[PDB]
Amino acid sequence: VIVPEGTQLDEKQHIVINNGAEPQSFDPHKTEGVPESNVAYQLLEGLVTSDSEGKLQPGAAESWENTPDFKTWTFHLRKDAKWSNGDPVTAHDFVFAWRRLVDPATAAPYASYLSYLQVENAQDIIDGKKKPAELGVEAKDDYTFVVHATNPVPYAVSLTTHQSLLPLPQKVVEKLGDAWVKKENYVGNGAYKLANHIINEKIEFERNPLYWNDKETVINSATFLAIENPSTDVARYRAGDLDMTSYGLPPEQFAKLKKELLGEVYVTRTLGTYSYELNNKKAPFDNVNIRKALNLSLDRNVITDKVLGQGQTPTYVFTPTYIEEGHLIQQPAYSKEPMAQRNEEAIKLLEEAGYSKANPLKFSILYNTNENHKKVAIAAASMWKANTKGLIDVKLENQEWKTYIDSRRAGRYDVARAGWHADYNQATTFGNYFLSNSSNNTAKYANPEYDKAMAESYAATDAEGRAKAYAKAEEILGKDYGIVPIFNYVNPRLVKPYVKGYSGKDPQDHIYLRNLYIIKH
């Protein structure tokens, strides 16, 4: 079906993809990053999934509907679908998984996701006020899963594609606990299963013959690598030892790669924002005046045009304004001032805060080991020093991905490199991040007025009303200088000419092995 008629498929159907880092975990309730989701999406499948262009398609649910108030969501599950051990996939698995997500005992980084979906009692369960069984989801019968929201969520279906809402094999997890995730124990309902895992080297996938749609799966086996540095990724690609890079390429090589690798360079415009997150509860970044100084004195065009130059676009707000219902979000006024004015304002604010050339503002930029991040941090450090005439002095601190995520979540940072990719193609995937009570909010940003602005969106009865509430939230977040937004992403990748089914058009840039195929000639 996915293969055009007549196409000469290769016999082996093996692919090697750089996944970029060692994942924290293969349990979708214990993770929050792209490396993790890329693994989970091969092994498990939720209600709805997506094609190579990011368009929604039936997953574990073959049909679904909503009540006209957008509060009741009913999903019709496939009657003959099975887990990789032969157990049936039922609505009970979904009830089980979604309860486990908000269960405080799970301590899930994405606990808040069912709060974002406005599911009855989700927030109360997260807050320890109600038992997980009180969650407003139910198995009306073995193949009918119903979601009950307290507010209208017209974008509900798009949320259900996220890794945090993947089903888990209840019978297995209830018996094994957290140990279900070990390779010997793992059971899933996705297109692949784990053949091997060597920490810091590779993850090997093999076909799950019990996947409901195995007959349309083409790739037989795949390897995910964990290569942190884009230049190493490119080197392995050019040695013919991997087939698809991760979504970073070395800026200084980019031009020549386009010239030499005709039709192998893909650049996807994605719903993503690259920021420096400020720790709003750690001195001195609890001071709005300093957060403001850092924003004024960072020239985004230097990073996008001079350091990277691959199509990244400067931004000064968190939400990408091209996301659906994002269109009324405004770039802040200072972004239109000349750098000379901005820098003069920044220097005043830092002097008022008691910094000088002799006693500069000192802090570290925490980032995950990646030469491209290092380059951006070097440029940021350099701009902040020069633009403030010596009143900021910035050190770099790189940590392995797992450690970096831990450090951010633990608040053990001053300023951290941060990228947020949309979980679903609607503005709240960004706006929800900065709610006071969001499990994703590692900035420790909290403004009741922000929360109130966001809450007004559920009182709106149309897209315009929602888009106005999102604009007001972003305004509030901007006046607080809660973070330092830098750019909206592109995702440059190399893909070999014999790899088919990668579009360059998926705004979330997922790679599902079930969407790919290797051609012969």
Partner: peptide, 4 residues
Amino acid sequence: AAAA
């Protein structure tokens, strides 16, 4: 999702 947090981007690598």
